[PDB]
Amino acid sequence: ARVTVQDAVEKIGNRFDLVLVAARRARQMQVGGKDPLVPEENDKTTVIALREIEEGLINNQILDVRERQEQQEQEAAELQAVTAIAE
């Protein structure tokens, strides 16, 4: 549950970066991207994103690291797939 973002802002110390970060993470979890890191409690995706931010489980750095990992697994699978389609 969520009523204030004071601690979330305490983590990402901007309240303007916080919105952009939470929107990124929430669009991830909303379109078929991912699954929450904090146990969802019948919360909507934005509030889940905030609850994750508060725990220090999400920030800009975390998201970029995760994204580059995703791209690299993408490269690995895609090269293997083209190789398979060859033979």
């Binding site: 303007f16 970066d17 919105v19 952009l20």
Partner: protein, 44 residues
């Protein structure tokens, strides 16, 4: 009239302008984006 006969050019550099044309305001949440944009410009 004056701007016409001067051929002015409006970089949009502002809040009222960016609202008129309907894009992310260069303040607040939009600020980040606009920053990044002018970095993409003045570059590749």
């Amino acid at each position: 009239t004056e701007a016409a006969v001067a051929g002015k050019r409006d970089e949009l550099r502002g809040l009222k302008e960016n609202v008129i044309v309907g894009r992310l305001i260069p303040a607040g949440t939009g600020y980040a984006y606009h920053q990044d944009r002018m970095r993409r410009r003045a570059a590749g």
